[PDB]
């Protein structure tokens, strides 16, 4: 409602670097807010795409940003009569970024990995890897829970059980308030998908450069399954956390599986031990139900509510015809120990192929009325197809069915304006939470400052 669409702020990266593919706010030890931006096709040293991360100080004018430097060199270790190998070419560093406390977690989901033992090998597969940084001190660390040293022949003998070679860990990322990093790995267990959790402090303390294969004892990975409903489900495409069981000491996980049960799509709510509490099934096949999940209390009862995006949902129209427009589902958490019922509200896009619901950002309380609000993105929507971000305000009965404000893309055609969103942080310190929007197609980020309600 009260986002200023006139005086925007634009940050920009190098051409073709996909600057803005992912973003987040970052507060330093002094509470100063900055913006961390991933650019998963930033050129490395060998003039080859490796990705990169930028840490942008807040300026009303915007501009260029300094790089948050990471080691982009391929690594090799000859240990235990074996040869360990990491390959950082086309790894997509910055395909997801997330900040917690004074720590930045940037992930390269397509970093490849292989192990050689004489004439056998583990196969060069994308296990993924995340890089951690404390910008004020200069500390660095890595976390790659799917790296293994099992040779290819063994996987075939054991029939590919517990095969973590294609995890692509870091595809999606989130950090609990207690500091436990939760990584989505949609390719784990032969494209079933897995989740990896470990404390941030233990990642830093148990990491040494050049080891390549090391243990994090406090880590916890999800479990393989023989149920075909999970086959090629990409369980872990999107991840989020919240409180859904009434006990405030436990933290619950929300996992998107957009091709679960033969492309039906599903979202599951689990405890910290990966035991399933609820499962929201998709409505329409190939809609990619679970492409994006968001957690925030919208109706102001203190109980977190769940939002699910299905950006390929095809709406029914006249003459038995279907129009791919996208849809968002709202689930309000009931009072006490009860199951999440049918959706409380259906928000459906308008522009054909607009992919409404591709990104959902909790905004906090934008208009300061007492109810939290959200932003939904249609990266190819709007009358021109340049992209749209729609703001929906919270109310006592859930959300308003019509938007309160619509942000049209200030970038040319094909910028994917809205593909990545982040809100609920006051960056200019005026008392109102603000919204950053990524447009990786144009290699830019736009900052919308919230203003007093007109």
């Amino acid at each position: 409602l009260n986002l200023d669409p006139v005086q925007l702020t634009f940050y920009a990266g190098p051409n073709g670097s996909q600057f803005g593919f992912s973003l987040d706010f970052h507060k330093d030890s002094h509470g100063r807010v900055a913006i961390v931006v991933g650019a998963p096709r930033t050129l490395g040293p060998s003039q080859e795409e490796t990705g990169g991360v930028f840490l942008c100080p807040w300026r009303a004018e915007g501009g260029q940003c300094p790089s948050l430097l990471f080691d982009l060199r391929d690594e090799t270790r000859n240990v235990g009569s074996q040869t360990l190998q990491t390959f950082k070419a086309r790894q997509g560093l910055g395909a997801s970024v997330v900040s917690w406390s004074d720590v930045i977690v940037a992930c390269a989901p397509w970093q490849h990995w292989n192990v050689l033992e004489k004439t056998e090998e583990a196969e060069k597969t994308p296990v993924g890897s995340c890089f951690l940084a404390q910008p004020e001190s200069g500390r660095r660390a890595e976390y790659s829970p799917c790296r293994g040293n099992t040779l290819s022949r063994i996987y075939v003998e054991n029939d590919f059980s517990w095969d973590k070679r294609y995890c692509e860990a870091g595809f999606s990322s989130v950090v609990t308030q207690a500091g436990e990093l939760v990584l989505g790995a949609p390719g784990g267990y032969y494209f079933l998908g897995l989740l990896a959790q470990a404390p941030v402090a233990d990642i830093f303390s148990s990491y040494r450069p050049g080891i390549l294969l090391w243990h994090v004892s406090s880590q916890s990975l999800s479990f393989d399954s023989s149920n075909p409903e999970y086959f090629d489900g990409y369980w872990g495409y999107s991840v989020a956390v919240g409180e859904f069981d009434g006990d405030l000491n436990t933290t619950e996980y929300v996992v998107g599986a957009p091709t679960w049960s033969w492309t039906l799509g599903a979202v599951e709510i689990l405890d910290s031990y990966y035991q399933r509490l609820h499962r929201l099934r998709g409505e329409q096949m190939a809609s990619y139900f679970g492409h994006s999940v968001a957690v925030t209390d919208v109706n102001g009862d203190g109980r977190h509510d769940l939002l699910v995006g299905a950006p390929l949902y095809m709406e029914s129209r006249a003459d038995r015809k279907l129009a791919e427009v996208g849809r968002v589902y709202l689930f309000l958490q009931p009072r006490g120990p009860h199951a999440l019922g049918a959706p409380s509200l259906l928000l459906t896009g308008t522009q054909l192929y607009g992919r409404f619901g591709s990104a959902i950002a909790p905004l906090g309380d934008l208009d300061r009325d007492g109810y939290n609000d959200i932003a939904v993105a249609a990266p190819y929507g709007g009358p021109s197809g340049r992209g749209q971000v729609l703001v929906f305000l919270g109310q006592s009965e859930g959300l308003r069915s019509r938007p309160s404000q619509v942000l049209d893309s200030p970038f040319p055609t094909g910028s994917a304006f809205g593909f990545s969103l982040r809100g609920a942080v006051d960056i200019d310190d005026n008392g109102y939470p603000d919204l950053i929007v990524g447009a990786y197609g144009a290699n830019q980020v736009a900052v919308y400052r919230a203003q007093p309600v007109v």
Partner: antibody
Amino acid sequence: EVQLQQSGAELVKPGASVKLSCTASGFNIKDTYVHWVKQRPEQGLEWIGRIDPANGYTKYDPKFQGKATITADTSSNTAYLQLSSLTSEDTAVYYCVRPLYDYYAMDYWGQGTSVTVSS
Amino acid sequence: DILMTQSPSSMSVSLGDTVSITCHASQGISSNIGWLQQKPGKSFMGLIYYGTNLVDGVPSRFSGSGSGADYSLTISSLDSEDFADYYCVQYAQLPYTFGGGTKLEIKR
């Protein structure tokens, strides 16, 4: 805390067999590799072999091929080292080892089991 | 197999001295070396892994260094607990092999 508690000292006759144990304390035995090392005052330390308790796959030094058999039961959180056709030269102290962070290291050690072969 | 030549066999030193044990391999092992300690009539304690990295709980007066096939364990300002046996171990190749050992003894 990581602690490896082995079996008590054994006293056996030559030609017989013995099965040592190594129980994990404060963690899951399935987490890392588990090695076995033999110690004698003259010959010093010798590496017997390892096992991955998650799957049961073992490696051995060709010297001990035949006498040493390493197994693991994730149920009791315990690893085992079986010695067969015992000899006077098998009288030694035996340790089980596991790494800290590095997958291939040798950091945490049990207290040791004293074996004595004699008629 | 990789031969670990650990020298010296023993040394007579005193409290507060700065001593240095060395370990020489038959080929390059690229920092894939560990250091052990065995107090008299007791079990082993890990000191260094991957050439230079301290094991959790080990005081900072220990330090590992070296490259290729020559490595060094150094103890700055000896304590009364530091008089014991010390072994190097390589894990660059299977089978793992150990050094002969080095015994620190009180000088008088």
